[PDB]
Amino acid sequence: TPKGSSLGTPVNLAVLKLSEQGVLDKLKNKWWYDKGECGAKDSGSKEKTSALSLSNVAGVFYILVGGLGLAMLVALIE
């Protein structure tokens, strides 16, 4: 606001008001992580276990399944 203006102090009080009732937090969450296209935002914080992700082992699981399917086929041809 301009120096010496009347609106500065009450809009200041308003900012404090909103922040104390959690409005600003709600707004940020809304326009940041709620509309987030990528998703899993708070995940990368709460879910950061390092360790091992299922996704890496998934491929091995798929060659296992496919191997069982080929095993099904070979079982049929026997």
Partner 1 sequence: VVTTILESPYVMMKKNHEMLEGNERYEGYCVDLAAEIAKHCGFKYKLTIVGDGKYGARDADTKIWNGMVGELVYGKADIAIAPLTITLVREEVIDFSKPFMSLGISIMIKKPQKSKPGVFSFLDPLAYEIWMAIVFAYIGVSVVLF
Partner 2 sequence: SLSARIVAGVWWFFTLIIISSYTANLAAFLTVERMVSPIESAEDLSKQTEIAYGTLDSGSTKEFFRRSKIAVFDKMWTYMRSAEPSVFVRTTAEGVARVRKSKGKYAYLLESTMNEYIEQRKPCDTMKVGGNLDSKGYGIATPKGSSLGTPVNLAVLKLSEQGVLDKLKNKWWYDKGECGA
List interacting residues with partner 1 (CB under 8 A): 12-13, 16-17, 20, 49, 51-54, 57-58, 61, 64-65, 68, 71-72
Interface ranges with partner 2 (CB under 8 A): 19-22, 25-26, 39-40, 42-43, 45-48, 50-52, 56-57, 60-61, 63-64, 67-68, 70-71, 74-75, 78
Closest CB 2 distance from partner 2, rounded Å: 15
**d(Cα 16, Cα 35) in Å, to the nearest integer?**
25
Whether residue 20 contacts residue 13, with contact meaning beta carbons closer than 8 Å, is answered with no
Shortest distance (Å) from residue 77 CB to partner 2:
8
Three-state SS annotation for 59-71: HHHHHHHHHHHHH
Q: What is the DSSP letter of 33?
A: I
